[PDB]
């Protein structure tokens, strides 16, 4: 089974990283134990959607391509290592984002920096090490692979796009013309930048490149299958599915039982959609209550969202995405029914 193989590769990669720290970086057993716990706490516990997508894509191509058994094993092992590079990249994002946002919990457990023996002083560096480990993995396991150059180049472009996206996200409640390192940033009063196009730019860069584009393209790279696809279509379908995924996360932050998007004045799908249909009085009530810690004001915003019938707007949004995704999957079938099926599976798991 794919998951059994994926989890076995984690144990192998962890042992490699920790043994390398001992033989080449003069690490002592106690610091190796601290890093082992850090790696387990930050990398494990999720559903492994991103890492498993690499494995599923590679498995698809193995079913329709002739290979010796040793080659099939090498491809699957490469897909598992590539998948862990993405999972560790996500771990890096989550550790740093939780510190930047002053988050409390991450998956019903305290954020890494909040652990008593961690603290922000170590946690920022722990997040830096998580990302360095993605590169150590790549250079060690893929040293002689023909796809090494393409995989490293794609990985840094995705990483940089994600960092740019984090900047778009954290500055989404500022008026762009007021951005200035010398002057403390006031929250927007007109909310003129809370538009569908601006929201789409935040989501595209902060989530879609690493959650959807990177796992799909890595699966193609380790399979030596980039010719079975039109890269403009892969990008188009990844950004579309990714946007839908973030819209779902935005809805959950507000309505799923234990989120601080309202208090943080985030440019969420809910605030943008609400502002796109609100009358003069509703806009005024939104402005008087948004981006405030006061629970009474948060309740006013949630109530405005509830009475605005945003469930109908979400249903219409969902219908349009289902429509466009189905269209892109059909266009993907021209060059590869195998790859189009992997995308269909990713969509099913998202939808």
Ligand X SMILES: Nc1ccc(Oc2ccc(F)cc2)cn1
By CB under 8 A, the residues from 21 to 60 that bind its own copies are 21, 25-28, 30-31, 33-34, 37-38, 41
**Six token digits for residue 212:** 């959807």
Minimum distance, C-beta of residue 23 to ligand X, in the bound complex (Å): 8
- Residues facing 105 on adjacent strands: 110
Minimum distance, C-beta of residue 195 to ligand X, in the bound complex (Å): 17
* Residue 46 DSSP label: S
CB of 48 within 8 A of CB of 6?
yes
Phi, psi of 278 (to 5 degrees): -65, 150
Is the CA virtual torsion 330, 332, 335, 336 positive or negative? negative
Token pair 């491809």 is at which residue?
A: 75
User: Which is nearer to ligand X, 50 or 286 (by Cβ)?
Assistant: 50
**Partner from its own copies, ligand X, Zn ion, none contacting 257, C-beta within 5 to 8 A by type:** none
User: Which is nearer to its own copies, 30 or 66 (by Cβ)?
Assistant: 30
| Contact call for residue 150 and Zn ion (CB under 5 A) | no
| Contact call for residue 324 and Zn ion (CB under 5 A) | no
Cβ within 8 Å of residue 286, ≥6 positions away:
191, 271, 274, 275, 278, 301, 304
Q: Which stretch binds its own copies (CB under 8 A): 63-71, 111-119, 285-293, 319-327?
A: 111-119
What's the rounded Cα separation, in Å, for the pair 119 and 75? 39
Question: Is 249 flagged in the annotation as binding?
Answer: yes
By CB under 8 A, the residues from 118 to 157 that bind its own copies are 118-122, 124-125, 128-129, 132-133, 135-136, 139, 149, 152-153, 156
Characterise 188 by phi-psi region: left (phi > 0), alpha (psi -120 to 50), beta (else).
beta
Question: Is 313 flagged in the annotation as binding?
Answer: no
Q: How many CA atoms lie within 13 A of 215 on its CB side?
A: 32
| Contact call for residue 97 and Zn ion (CB under 5 A) | yes
**Six token digits for residue 272:** 């943008």
Minimum distance, C-beta of residue 164 to Zn ion, in the bound complex (Å): 14
User: Which is nearer to ligand X, 65 or 166 (by Cβ)?
Assistant: 166
What's the rounded Cα separation, in Å, for the pair 231 and 7? 30
Question: Is 253 flagged in the annotation as binding?
Answer: yes
What's the rounded Cα separation, in Å, for the pair 279 and 121? 47
User: Which is nearer to ligand X, 83 or 165 (by Cβ)?
Assistant: 165
* Residue ranges that bind its own copies, judged by CB under 8 A: 21, 25-28, 30-31, 33-34, 37-38, 41, 96, 99-101, 115-122, 124-125, 128-129, 132-133, 135-136, 139, 149, 152-153, 156, 159-161, 163-164, 166-168, 170-171, 176-177, 179-185, 201, 204-205
* Residue ranges that bind Zn ion, judged by CB under 5 A: 97, 101
């Amino acid at each position: 089974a794919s998951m059994e193989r994926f989890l076995s590769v984690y144990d192998e990669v962890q042992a490699f990283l920790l043994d390398q720290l001992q033989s080449k970086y003069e690490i002592d057993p106690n610091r190796a134990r601290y890093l082992r716990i850090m790696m387990d706490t930050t990398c494990l516990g999720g559903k492994y959607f991103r890492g498993m997508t690499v494995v599923n894509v590679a498995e698809g191509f193995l079913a329709v391509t002739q290979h010796d058994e040793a080659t099939k094993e090498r491809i699957l092992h490469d897909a598992c290592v590539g998948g862990w590079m993405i999972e560790f990249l996500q771990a890096h994002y989550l550790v740093e984002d939780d510190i930047m946002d002053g988050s409390v919990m991450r998956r019903g457990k305290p954020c890494w920096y909040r652990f008593p023996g961690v603290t922000t002083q170590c946690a920022i560096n722990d997040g830096i090490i998580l990302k360095s480990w993605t590169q150590i993995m790549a250079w060690h396991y893929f040293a002689d692979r023909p796809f090494l150059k393409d995989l490293l180049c794609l990985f840094q472009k995705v990483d940089y796009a994600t960092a740019v996206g984090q900047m778009y996200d954290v500055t989404s409640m500022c008026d762009s013309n007021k951005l200035d390192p010398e002057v403390a940033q006031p929250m927007t009063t007109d909310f003129a930048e809370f538009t569908p196009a601006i929201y789409k730019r935040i989501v595209k860069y902060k989530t879609t490149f690493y959650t959807y584009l990177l796992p799909l393209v890595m699966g193609l790279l380790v399979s030596e299958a980039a010719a079975s696809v039109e890269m403009n279509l892969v990008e188009r379908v990844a950004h579309l599915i990714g946007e839908y995924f973030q819209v779902q996360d935005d809805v959950m932050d507000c309505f799923t039982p234990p989120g601080t998007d309202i208090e943080d004045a985030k440019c969420s799908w809910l605030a943008v959609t609400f502002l796109g249909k609100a009358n003069a009085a509703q806009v005024a009530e939104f402005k008087a209550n948004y981006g405030e810690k006061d629970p009474a004001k948060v309740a006013v915003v949630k109530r405005l969202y509830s009475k605005a019938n945003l469930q109908a707007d979400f249903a219409a949004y969902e219908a349009e995405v289902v429509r466009e995704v189905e269209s892109l999957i059909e266009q993907l079938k021209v060059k590869s029914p195998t790859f189009a099926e992997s995308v269909a599976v990713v969509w099913e798991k998202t939808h």
